[PDB]
RNA sequence: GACUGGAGUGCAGAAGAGGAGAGUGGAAUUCCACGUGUAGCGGUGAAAUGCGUAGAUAUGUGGAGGAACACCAGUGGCGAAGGCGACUCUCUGGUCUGUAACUGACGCUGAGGCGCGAAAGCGUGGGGAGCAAACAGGAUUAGAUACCCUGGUAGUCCACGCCGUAAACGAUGAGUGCUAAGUGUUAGGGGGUUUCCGCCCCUUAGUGCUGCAGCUAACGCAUUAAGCACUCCGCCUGGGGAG
C-alpha cells in the first residue's frame, strides 16, 4: 500500500490535524490493506503466508474496534458506516 | 598424422584409452579386456599402462609425435596411463579433465548395502 | 518505478536493419505507459560463450521509468519471439 | 580487508565485467569469502551481480 | 478522569533461499540421427544375468525430452511451524534498528472452533529424463520370499482436490521481568581517533561456542536457563493389554 495513498487515507479521517496514530486511522488503513489482500488471495489462493498476515491485520482491526466501542460508542457507530464494516 | 588427442576413461572397474584426431575421428583404442584381462585386474595401473602402450603403438599407424590427454573418472590408473603415453615415444602436450560433473541435476543411484 | 533493461542483438544485421529494430522496441516501450529516459550501446562485443554459431553481439541498454510494466511484458515476449534478440534482461532499481 | 567496504563503493553493477572477473576462477567459478577478502553483504551482492552477468553472457560458466 | 516504560500507528533507514504466479539459462543423466570406429562393455568379494559384429563401449556434431539447480554456501538469512537455495518481473506477508511525532493499557494466554501442515498415499488428466518400492533374472547362502548385480511398474514432477501422520525433535509450550563473565558471527544505530580507510568502546534484535552463581538423579542448562518469580493453556500419574 503506497505511501501517498496511505497519507491520503490517514489525513482524511484523522480526528485532528496532528494525529496519525488514532484507532480511526489504524482501522481505516487496515481496511484498505485487508481489502487489497482479499483481492490478492482471490487471485493467489494458495499464498497462505500472505493469508497469515491478512488474518493478523483483521485481528488487530477487531481489537482496535472493540477498544473504540468500549471507549466511545458514537465513534464506533460512525466508523462502521463510514468504512463499510458489519 | 602429426598430433592426436587421447581420451582415457578410468574407473574403479576398467580403463579404456582411445586415440583420435583433433576433430574427433577414431583411429584406434584399447582396454584391459582387449589386452587380455578378465576381472578386477582390469582396474589396475599395470593394465592401464599396457592398454595405453598398445593404443599408442597402433596410433603410430598414421603416425604422430604429440598428444593432448583428457582424463575421465576416478580410476587410479590415470597416472600410469599418462606415464605410458609419455614414455611410449610421444610428446604429451597437455593433460585436461573430462570429469562429467552435474550441477546437481539427475540424481545418482543408491548407496551400497542399504 | 525505475526499470533498467539490457539486451543483445545478433551479429548478422546491417546498420539500417539494426537501428530499425532498436527504434522499434523503443517505440514498443514508450507507446505504452513508460518514457525512455535513455537508451545506449556498448558495442559489438564478445560473448563469454556461444548461444548459436554467433559469438559476437550488440550490447544495448535502456534506462526507463514506468508503472504499468506492460511495456516490459510486450518487450519481453516480442523480443523472445523475434529472431534478432537472443538475450534480454529487465531489472528494478 | 574487503574491497568494497574498504573503498566505500557500496553499489555493485553486473556490467563491470572487468572488475567482477577478479572473483571468478579461470574455470568460471565464484570464489569464497575467505579467499576473496569480501564481507557477507557484498559477497551476496557479488553473487547476484555475477549471476546476472553470466545470464547476459557477460561472464562464462566454464 | 489523567499519564506513558507495555501495546500499536506515523516518520527515516537496513537485511533477507518468507510465500504465489509467469517467464527465462546452462551445466549434466538419458534418448534419436549421422560420421570415425573394432570386439568388447558393464559389474563384483569373486562372478554371472545383461548390452554388443543387425556394430556397440567410446568420440564429435546437431536435435528432443523432462528433473534438480555446483561454486557462492557458512553451528549464515528468513519463516508460526512444516520448510524455503539458478535468474528476472509482478503481487504480497512479516522482522529489526533509530525517533519520541500520534493513540493512550488498546494487552498476555487461549478451552471449544478455523486454517496451515515433511514424505508416503488416494481421485481425475497430463508429463515421465533419471532414481525406484513391487516384480523378473543372476549370484549369495544350509535356505535367502534380503543385503549384492543387471533390468524394471507404481510412484517421484505438474494442475485441482483429499489425506492431516512424523525421531512433525531444541524429544525443551506462549508471554513478562530479574540474576556474573569471555568470544565468534549476522543485521543496525551512537560516540572517540584518524585523510577516508582502519581501530576502539557503548547499545538494540538474532545466532553459535565456553563458562560463575543457582537448579538438576546425574548427564548437563547457564541473559537463546533446564535459574529466580507471576499469568495462561495443554498434558502425566507403574509396565503391558492398547493407542
Ligand atoms: K497421483
Ligand atoms: K524437522
Ligand atoms: Mg506427495
Swiss-Prot record, chain A:
GO cellular component, one term: cytosolic small ribosomal subunit
Family assignment from sequence similarity: Belongs to the universal ribosomal protein uS15 family.
NCBIfam families in UniProt: S15_bact
Subunit-level organization: Part of the 30S ribosomal subunit. Forms a bridge to the 50S subunit in the 70S ribosome, contacting the 23S rRNA.
Keywords for the protein's UniProt record, in alphabetical order: Ribonucleoprotein, Ribosomal protein, RNA-binding, rRNA-binding
Protein name (database record): Small ribosomal subunit protein uS15
Encoding gene, per UniProt annotation: rpsO
Native source species: Listeria monocytogenes serovar 1/2a (strain ATCC BAA-679 / EGD-e)
Keyword Ribonucleoprotein among record annotations: yes
Curated annotation (Swiss-Prot), chain B:
InterPro entries (alphabetical): Ribosomal_uS11 (IPR001971), Ribosomal_uS11_bac-type (IPR019981), Ribosomal_uS11_CS (IPR018102), Ribosomal_uS11_sf (IPR036967)
Keyword rRNA-binding on entry: yes
SUPFAM superfamilies: Translational machinery components (SSF53137)
GO function terms (MF aspect): rRNA binding; structural constituent of ribosome
Domain of life: Bacteria
GO terms for biological process, alphabetical: translation
Protein keywords: Ribonucleoprotein, Ribosomal protein, RNA-binding, rRNA-binding
GO cellular component, one term: cytosolic small ribosomal subunit
Family classification: Belongs to the universal ribosomal protein uS11 family.
NCBIfam families named in the record: PRK05309.1, uS11_bact
Quaternary assembly: Part of the 30S ribosomal subunit. Interacts with proteins S7 and S18. Binds to IF-3.
Protein purpose: Located on the platform of the 30S subunit, it bridges several disparate RNA helices of the 16S rRNA. Forms part of the Shine-Dalgarno cleft in the 70S ribosome.
Protein name in UniProt: Small ribosomal subunit protein uS11
Source organism (scientific name): Listeria monocytogenes serovar 1/2a (strain ATCC BAA-679 / EGD-e)
Gene for this chain: rpsK
UniProtKB/Swiss-Prot annotation, chain C:
SUPFAM superfamilies: Ribosomal protein S6
PROSITE patterns recorded: RIBOSOMAL_S6
The organism's place on the tree of life at top rank: Bacteria
One Pfam family per UniProt: Ribosomal_S6
Sample GO molecular function, one term: small ribosomal subunit rRNA binding
N-terminal signal peptide: none
CDD domains attached to this UniProt entry: bS6
The entry's keywords: Ribonucleoprotein, Ribosomal protein, RNA-binding, rRNA-binding
GO terms, biological process: translation
Gene3D superfamilies the UniProt entry points to: 3.30.70.60
GO cellular component, one term: ribosome
HAMAP family, A to Z: Ribosomal_bS6 (MF_00360)
Family: Belongs to the bacterial ribosomal protein bS6 family.
Function: Binds together with bS18 to 16S ribosomal RNA.
NCBIfam families per record: S6 (TIGR00166)
Name of the protein in question: Small ribosomal subunit protein bS6
Originating organism: Listeria monocytogenes serovar 1/2a (strain ATCC BAA-679 / EGD-e)
Curated annotation (Swiss-Prot), chain D:
Domain of life according to the entry: Bacteria
Gene Ontology annotations of biological process type: translation
Molecular-function GO terms, alphabetical: small ribosomal subunit rRNA binding; structural constituent of ribosome
Coiled-coil segments on the chain, per record: none
Keyword check for RNA-binding: yes
GO cellular component, one term: cytosolic small ribosomal subunit
Keywords attached to this entry: Ribonucleoprotein, Ribosomal protein, RNA-binding, rRNA-binding
Keyword ATP-binding: no
Subunit record text: Part of the 30S ribosomal subunit. Forms a tight heterodimer with protein bS6.
Known function: Binds as a heterodimer with protein bS6 to the central domain of the 16S rRNA, where it helps stabilize the platform of the 30S subunit.
Family membership: Belongs to the bacterial ribosomal protein bS18 family.
Protein name, UniProt field: Small ribosomal subunit protein bS18
Source species of the chain: Listeria monocytogenes serovar 1/2a (strain ATCC BAA-679 / EGD-e)
Whole sequence portion shown: 14 to 75 of 79
Amino acid at each position: 500500500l503506497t505511501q501517498e495513498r496511505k497519507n491520503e487515507i490517514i489525513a482524511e479521517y484523522r480526528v485532528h490535524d496532528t494525529d496519525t496514530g488514532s484507532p480511526e486511522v489504524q482501522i481505516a488503513v487496515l481496511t484498505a490493506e485487508i481489502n487489497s489482500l482479499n483481492e490478492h488471495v482471490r487471485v493467489h489462493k494458495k499464498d497462505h503466508h500472505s493469508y497469515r498476515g491478512l488474518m493478523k491485520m483483521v485481528g488487530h482491526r477487531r481489537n482496535l474496534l472493540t477498544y473504540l466501542r468500549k471507549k466511545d460508542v458514537q465513534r464506533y457507530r460512525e466508523l462502521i458506516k463510514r468504512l463499510g464494516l458489519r | 598424422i602429426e598430433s592426436g588427442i587421447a581420451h582415457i576413461r578410468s574407473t574403479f572397474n576398467n580403463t579404456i584409452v582411445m586415440i583420435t584426431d583433433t576433430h574427433g575421428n577414431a583411429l584406434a583404442w584399447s582396454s584391459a579386456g582387449s589386452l587380455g584381462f578378465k576381472g578386477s585386474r582390469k582396474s589396475t595401473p599395470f593394465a592401464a599402462q599396457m592398454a595405453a602402450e598398445s593404443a599408442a603403438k597402433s596410433a603410430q599407424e598414421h603416425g604422430l609425435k604429440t598428444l593432448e590427454v583428457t582424463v575421465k573418472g576416478p580410476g587410479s590408473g590415470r597416472e600410469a596411463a599418462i606415464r605410458a603415453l609419455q614414455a611410449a615415444g610421444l610428446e604429451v602436450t597437455a593433460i585436461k579433465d573430462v570429469t562429467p560433473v552435474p550441477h546437481n541435476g539427475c540424481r545418482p543411484p543408491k548407496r551400497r548395502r542399504v | 518505478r525505475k526499470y533498467e533493461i539490457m539486451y543483445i542483438i545478433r551479429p548478422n544485421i546491417e546498420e539500417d536493419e539494426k537501428k530499425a529494430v532498436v527504434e522499434r522496441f523503443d517505440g514498443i516501450l514508450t507507446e505504452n505507459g513508460a518514457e525512455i529516459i535513455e537508451s545506449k550501446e556498448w558495442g559489438k562485443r564478445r560473448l563469454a560463450y556461444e548461444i548459436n554459431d554467433y559469438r559476437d553481439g550488440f550490447y544495448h541498454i535502456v534506462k526507463l521509468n514506468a508503472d504499468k510494466a506492460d511495456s516490459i511484458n510486450e518487450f519481453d515476449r516480442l523480443a523472445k519471439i523475434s529472431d534478432d534478440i537472443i538475450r534480454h534482461m529487465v531489472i528494478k532499481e | 580487508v574487503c574491497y568494497f567496504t574498504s573503498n566505500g563503493i557500496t553499489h555493485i553493477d553486473y556490467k563491470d565485467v572487468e572488475l567482477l572477473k577478479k572473483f571468478v576462477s579461470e574455470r568460471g567459478k565464484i570464489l569464497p569469502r575467505r579467499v576473496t577478502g569480501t564481507s557477507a553483504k557484498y559477497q551476496r551482492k557479488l553473487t547476484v551481480a555475477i549471476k546476472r552477468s553470466r545470464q547476459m553472457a557477460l561472464l562464462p560458466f566454464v
